[PDB]
Design a protein around this ligand. Structure first.
Ligand SMILES: [K+]
Ligand SMILES: [K+]
Ligand SMILES: [K+]
Ligand SMILES: [K+]
Lengths: 259, 23, 259, 259, 259, 23, 23, 23
């Protein structure tokens, strides 16, 4: 019956002292890993005799590797314990938290296997980027994060229509903008895919200004694009906000009922 | 619960530091 | 009774196998046409001995013409079959889907008739732009798109007032901005219509920054313009969102009632 | 009893034929005046032997003056007839529509009195700007415009708090931004009032980019300023939208009750 | 019983004449102090023989010091009277209004103690910045300001989740943006913390344009960042607006009940 | 109602045009 | 339904390709 | 209430002005 005891500790950290210390230790090392991954890219100043300033992760490669190894070992022991204490192991493995944990730990081991290709870009940059998904292990510590996941899953059809109608509007407005603006002098609107960038920046009302229309037709269709983007993006926002509040309120009804 | 977690955190941090100093 | 059978197949694609294959074939070729129209503007690299990179549609004019011809022939046979199987043919022809289909197919035939003027701009660019409205044939495949059409028709008075009050605010603020900013050195505010562009960019909170006031009065009235634009644009958004949700919920009440 | 008949015609244009023709004539000349005031600032091309392109209003000063005179005479005869047929003349004169009409007609007569100072700026530009308020005479033709006036009057306390809290936030963030950014090289943040412009552009999420922070403290407080501005501006928007919808719905309840 | 009389006057300014005059005097000098603190940074023109224009606060250091001294003495006498007339003095001292008053008055006395370090930056700039929190003494005059404080306290958990999820999204998108954009020529994306600025400007839809992606991956992830920021920021806004309206309506129910 | 308003509008526009042509 | 549509799509795509290769 | 507050405000402003003029 020790397996179910360990599982109960893992699922309910606040029931047991050992569960709670495990909870806090893992949360602390998630924060440590995230901060280290950010900090290792910061220029640490020019080293003695160095041509240029070196990133902290390059100047202290051993220290950052040791910190990464400690965090990854903690995450791996955590995941292996969760797998060991799972009632239905396959059901655990296919759960979203398990996918998050596996995505968090895999890049370290892949980078070990591909240490010869560490200098080679492409894969190195991909592993570096995938290291940032360890921040999703905070979903086990944040109830709001889990509620956000539940509401995104709940609003799947509205998000799908958001993607579809946004794609439609982007294509339409980029076509019109490209044909209105391609003849301008030194035009940034060099193709319809190039005009995708302008269209998405206009629809969200970012307005970077790196791409701007210069013709009258360009101005007219850019204005219409901004308004249409406002409408398209506003369509699913009330649904998402309402479902988030609904799930939060259901959680707090359950909490006050059982306590 | 907080105290034991803090103690474990300090132990593991010390081990990381000693590993760094060794290498 | 074959006419009503074909019509039932066309209106309800999922009832029959032939209707469903026709549905999927037409949807696939709509997507193909849209993608090809986007891709033909992409620079395909400098051709052997070419001075500059050539757009894919110019380097492979025959291939893109063949793809366009296939898509247009499919759309035309589809439209002719729908016209043949329509109970009230004139009622079909005046429907919105029929107008969409006709707008989708006409530019191809007009461009055939005006093949001598294909090099000549103006009409060529207009036909190229009108080719992007084939994406509206997805309204036959997307229920959300039809619901969006229904809610835009439902909110016609609020959209009309949006256009009217937006025009009023644009004129007022462009007048004030032009008179506040016309005296600045190298002023972009060269007329009230020129200030229309600044005013619409400020009201939507785009803020490209290509036009910015330099005088104190300009700053004050630009700030007021941004806030007033926020108010004017926010007036119809709740109505549109509410009607979209209402129409979606009515559709899903009908769906659960009949099934 | 002719006075009350004329008043009833003026208040209810659709009851009588003469009232309706008066309504449409005045609306047409409001639109004509607004369009002419916009167009007279457009460069009309370089005149024969002219050094630079001349604005339409300068190239055709006689024509634009005649159009302005016709519109102003129509507006003045309209206003005098309304004053003559008013039951309580003083109550009419103090009404908002009367103030709009007087503001619409006065600049013409003042410009006649100050024809010697027409070349002199300051007053000339002020009269030119005040001519754009003739567009507010469309409130007699637009029910949505009157409803917007009613809801702005209804939400007076919330708009007052919007102004007050916006002023407070602008002052606070401009102070912080100025002290964070004044030491930068070629800093645009040359005083707290100079930082007002940055703060208002950031709070509304315009983001022109003409003023941007360069220091870390500047970035932090600019981010906080953008979020705080979003909150402050969002506070009264639901109230205004709700009251607009409420007044519209009450109007349509009254319309369906009496008809 | 004079202590409770003075306290009742202070808590309810409108009950007594002396309380009301004290109320208006303090409000006037709050406004005076705020305006003076803004104005002292404005360049006052080049002084006779001066190399450059001098800020009003430097050209008239004695006058501004006297105005500051008068305002601070009024605030200090006000605070000391409130402390004297408080029923539970310690409960008063720990209240939010008392903290505001102490933060308002302390920088003056600290600057007196550190008059030798007035030329020295760092502390001088900090005291100058802390002088702007005297504007929070208007919370005693504005009911909307107190209601805003109550709703911010009421929505503490939602604001905490806003901060947490905003931090998470900023870190994720800055990591991705930095790795997508670090290789660009003259890239502003020199570290993940450098990309924090781009990410926060994109998420709020400011779009300054000082940092913009140049790679395709950069454009894609910038677009996704803008949409995700819209969602994250929109999550707590309805809650805050609803609680503000609820607290206002409860206040007006109480006001109409007791009067 | 529309027709009479249009007639009056045309008359007034013609008078404006003749005034412009005169001056 | 999906399979027959996919078969027809492949047939039509092959015909387009052969038309392109011919011209 | 307003009048007495205004009177006090004017008195204090005059005292500030005289202090400035003195220094
Ligand atoms: K912008
Ligand atoms: K910008
Ligand atoms: K924006
Ligand atoms: K913007």
């Amino acid at each position: 019956t020790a397996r179910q005891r360990v599982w109960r500790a893992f699922e309910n950290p606040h029931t047991s002292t050992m569960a709670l210390v495990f909870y806090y230790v893992t949360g602390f090392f998630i924060a440590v890993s995230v901060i280290a991954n950010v900090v290792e890219t910061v220029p640490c100043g020019s080293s003695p005799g160095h041509i240029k300033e070196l990133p902290c992760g390059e100047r202290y490669a051993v220290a950052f590797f040791c910190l990464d190894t400690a965090c990854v070992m903690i995450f791996t022991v955590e995941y292996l314990l969760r797998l060991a204490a799972a009632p239905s192991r396959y059901r655990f493995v296919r759960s979203v938290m398990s996918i998050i944990d596996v995505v968090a730990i895999l890049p370290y081991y892949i980078g070990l296997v591909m240490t010869d290709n560490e200098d080679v870009s492409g894969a190195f940059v991909t592993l570096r980027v995938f290291r940032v998904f360890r921040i999703f292990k905070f979903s086990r510590h944040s109830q709001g994060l889990r509620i956000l996941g539940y509401t995104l899953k709940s609003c799947a059809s509205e998000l799908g229509f958001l993607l579809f109608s946004l794609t439609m509007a982007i294509i339409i407005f980029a076509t019109v903008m490209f044909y209105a603006e391609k003849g301008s002098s030194a035009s940034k609107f060099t193709s319809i895919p190039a005009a995708f960038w302008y269209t998405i920046v206009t629809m969200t009302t970012l307005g970077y200004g790196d791409m701007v229309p210069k013709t009258i037709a360009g101005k007219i269709f850019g204005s219409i694009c901004s308004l249409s983007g406002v409408l398209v993006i506003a369509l699913p926002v009330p649904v998402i906000v309402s479902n988030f509040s609904r799930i939060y309120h259901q959680n707090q009804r359950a909490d006050k009922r059982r306590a | 619960g907080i105290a034991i977690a803090l103690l474990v955190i300090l132990v593991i941090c010390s081990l990381i530091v000693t590993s760094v100093i060794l290498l």
